[PDB]
Design a protein around this ligand. Structure first.
Ligand SMILES: Cc1cc2nc3c(=O)[nH]c(=O)nc-3n(C[C@H](O)[C@H](O)[C@H](O)COP(=O)(O)OP(=O)(O)OC[C@H]3O[C@@H](n4cnc5c(N)ncnc54)[C@H](O)[C@@H]3O)c2cc1C
Ligand SMILES: Cc1cc2nc3c(=O)[nH]c(=O)nc-3n(C[C@H](O)[C@H](O)[C@H](O)COP(=O)(O)OP(=O)(O)OC[C@H]3O[C@@H](n4cnc5c(N)ncnc54)[C@H](O)[C@@H]3O)c2cc1C
Lengths: 115, 115
């Protein structure tokens, strides 16, 4: 009942996905080489500091199997959506339909339900 | 009424502070030089990608006035709390008492109200 408490593993995850997907959503469609490098490093460093040890370890192993594609906004928003679906699948959750990532994290549902 | 919508500036901020303060809260008390460097760069790169343009610009100017202290968990959790209070003050919000940052973001209130 008290809101202003340290987030548990689940609440930190929902915050963290919101942050990651929203950052990805506004990433350039034609990012410069430095931007492409900087976003790869950001994600690397996120994985180093993520504070749930079980989450961060599994994450670092995934990232070794699957390097972030930061070539464009389209590639990177998709990459990250596929990343998040691995974790969903691991945890017994359904796949999120990655064709919806712009509606979900940038533009709002096309039916106007976020307006 | 629909939860699964792109966060607005305020909702992204509350997610982002939760992430930043929770990362800081679990940062080492005696971090290695590389960890100290990595956390400085993480914060730098966060400021590059933060997607509210007005927020990110003001943030990058603050960070130029006030470089992150990543020497220890104590110094860095305090630094970040002072950073967040600048933004609070800017926006007409009261100061958060920085002596409470461990209770708020790591340990829970000492009265046990998060238990
Ligand atoms: C990097 C990272 C690693 C994690 N690793 C673990 C772990 O190893 N073990 C563990 O127990 N927990 C882990 N978590 C926490 C976990 O992934 C969830 O955040 C938590 O279980 C709560 O899940 P949820 O059902 O509320 O929705 P979440 O998975 O938090 O998702 C939040 C919202 O994102 C949207 N969404 C869902 N899937 C996608 C997608 N693929 N692409 C774009 N949007 C999507 C949906 O709207 C959903 O409601 C991790 C979190 C992060 C950020
Ligand atoms: C890096 C960054 C820069 C931003 N810049 C702007 C900007 O320029 N203009 C703008 O309008 N919005 C900005 N925001 C959004 C803004 O700071 C708030 O997140 C948003 O206004 C909602 O505020 P809130 O009252 O819900 O609480 P928030 O400020 O989001 O705080 C969330 C919670 O953190 C705790 N808290 C509050 N202060 C501290 C503290 N100092 N230390 C530790 N914990 C604390 C409290 O429990 C509070 O409920 C920024 C957000 C971030 C993350």
């Amino acid at each position: 009942f008290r809101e202003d408490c340290p987030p548990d593993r689940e609440e930190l995850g929902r915050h963290s996905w919101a942050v990651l997907h929203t950052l990805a959503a506004y990433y350039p469609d034609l990012p410069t080489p430095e931007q492409q490098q900087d976003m790869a490093q950001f994600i690397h460093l996120f994985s180093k500091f993520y504070p749930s040890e079980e989450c961060a370890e599994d994450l670092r192993k995934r990232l070794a199997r699957n390097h972030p594609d930061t070539r464009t906004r389209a590639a990177f928003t998709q990459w990250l959506c596929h990343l998040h679906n691995e974790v969903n699948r691991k945890l017994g959750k359904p796949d999120f339909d990655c064709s919806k990532v712009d509606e979900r994290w940038r533009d709002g549902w096309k039916d106007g339900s976020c307006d």
